[PDB]
Each structure stands twice: as C-alpha cells, then as structure tokens.
C-alpha cells in the first residue's frame, strides 16, 4: 500500500525499524518513511509511532 514512487526510497535509502534499505517506502501520518513490509508488520504488532510514540489516528 505504497503511494510514493521508488524515487523517494532511492533518495532516502534507510529504514528506521528493520534498518538497512530496500525499495518499498510508505509515509506515516506522523512523519516517517517505512517500508511496506516493515510498516505492515508494525501495524500487525502495534499501531504506535516507533519514534513519536504517538498512536496513529489514521
Ligand atoms: Zn524497512
Ligand atoms: Zn514518527
């Protein structure tokens, strides 16, 4: 569920959760770029901001 182009990922090749870099890159309502697998996995585990520690209302 990524609406951003791979261009963004290339420009920002670095994960905050799973670390490293890949391709898929989605943006959270808080202001963070997470991969499809990294995010999805996060949403399945917890719906909280890894950094902001704030719950996403969307
Ligand atoms: Zn990642
Ligand atoms: Zn955040």
Q: How far is the CA of 39 from the centre of ligand 1 (A)?
A: 8
Longest dimension (CA), the chain: 28
User: Exposed e or buried b for every residue in 44-57, given b needs 16+ CB within 10 A?
Assistant: eeeeebeeeeeeee
* Domains by residue range for the chain, with CATH: 1-58 (3.30.40.10)
Q: Alpha-carbon distance 12 to 22, whole Å? A: 10
Q: How far is CA 30 from the centre of its chain?
A: 10
Give the Å distance between the CA of 53 and the centre of ligand 2. 7
- Alpha-carbon gap, residue 34 to 41, rounded angstroms: 10
- Asked if 36 and 49 count as a contact pair (C-beta separation under 8 A), the reply is no
On whether the CB atoms of residues 1 and 20 are closer than 8 A, the answer is no
Method by which the model was determined: NMR
What's the CA gap between 58 and 56, in Å, rounded? 5
């Amino acid at each position: 569920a990524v609406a951003t182009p791979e261009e963004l990922a290339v420009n920002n090749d670095d994960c905050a959760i799973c670390w490293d870099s890949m391709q898929a890159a989605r943006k959270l309502p808080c202001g963070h770029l997470f991969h499809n697998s990294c995010l999805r996995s996060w949403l399945e585990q917890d719906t909280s901001c890894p950094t902001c520690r704030m719950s996403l209302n969307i």
